């Protein structure tokens, strides 16, 4: 019995297994990683020995994800995660590589929140039990699952087209649309609000916080269909489903008072989603 990654690299106590993730919202649970495309095992003596592999209780997330509960799909069936009991067995009865049919999910706890996971960091500590139908061999070992690429795991029922958006305005004056859409695994009554450092009493102009050679007299103002969106004011999108819906935002310049002088302009504006 032996296992390898999607890279073909053999999985060796404990082993560090690096996998690629494509996290995503599903209905009622969010995918963290589908390990069935990442981990493959086989049987070295299938004509005389059948191998069995289970997921032992105590298997759980690690790193930034250790705070979240969810589920594990093991060989087509769902179990609480962290696991509280041993799963049924997967059988390996062939020399040909077969997937380790495991997918790790997260219970949605936000509207459209996300947790950044960087490459090289631990996402899960999995405990396996290996037996056979031939002798009394019964051993446990640990697989530490590491991310092999930078991702963001969605923690909500909805997800965005991008977590970090950089837009460039034309030289003053001028406007640029902000590319940003949202969708939900199932239909949700969804809204959003802006936050950031504002310059005016009406909280309608985000301050020019450019560090190097900043301009004077101007800030950034966002509109939606020609209407000013002030900070901390919920924009309703109505019911949002699986079809991507634009937030409908456009960036503009706006005068903050006094003489307008040459220099750089920058504003960092947060978007936060809420259920309505």
């Amino acid at each position: 019995f032996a296992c390898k990654t999607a890279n073909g690299t053999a999985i060796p106590g404990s082993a560090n297994v690096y996998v690629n993730l494509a996290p995503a919202v599903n209905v009622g649970q969010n995918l963290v990683v589908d390990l069935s495309t990442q981990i493959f095992c086989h049987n070295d003596y299938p004509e005389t020995i059948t191998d069995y592999v289970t997921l032992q209780r105590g298997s759980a997330y690690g790193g930034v994800l250790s705070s979240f509960s969810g589920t594990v799909k093991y060989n087509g069936s769902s179990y609480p995660f962290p696991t509280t009991s041993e799963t049924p067995r997967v059988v390996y009865n062939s020399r040909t590589d077969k997937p380790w049919p495991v997918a790790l999910y997260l219970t949605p706890v936000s509207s459209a929140g996300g947790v950044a996971i960087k490459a090289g960091s631990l996402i899960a500590v999995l405990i396996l039990r290996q037996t056979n139908n031939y002798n009394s061999d019964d051993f446990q070992f640990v697989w530490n699952i590491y991310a092999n690429n930078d991702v963001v795991v969605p923690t909500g029922g909805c997800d965005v087209s991008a977590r970090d958006v950089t837009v460039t305005l034309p030289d003053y004056p001028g406007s640029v649309p902000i590319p940003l859409t949202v969708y939900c695994a199932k239909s949700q009554n969804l809204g959003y609000y802006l936050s950031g450092t504002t310059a005016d009493a009406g909280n309608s102009i985000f301050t020019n916080t450019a560090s190097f050679s900043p301009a004077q007299g101007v800030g950034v103002q966002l509109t939606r269909n020609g209407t000013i969106i002030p900070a901390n004011n919920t924009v309703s999108l109505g019911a949002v489903g699986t079809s991507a819906v634009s937030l409908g935002l456009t960036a503009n310049y706006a005068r903050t008072g006094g003489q307008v002088t040459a220099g750089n302009v920058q504003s960092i504006i947060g978007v936060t989603f809420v259920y309505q």
Binding site: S111, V160, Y172, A215, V220, V265, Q266, I269, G270
Partner: peptide, 12 residues
Amino acid sequence: ADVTITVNGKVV
């Protein structure tokens, strides 16, 4: 915030 928008501009 769930998304961070950085808006860059220039006055010439």
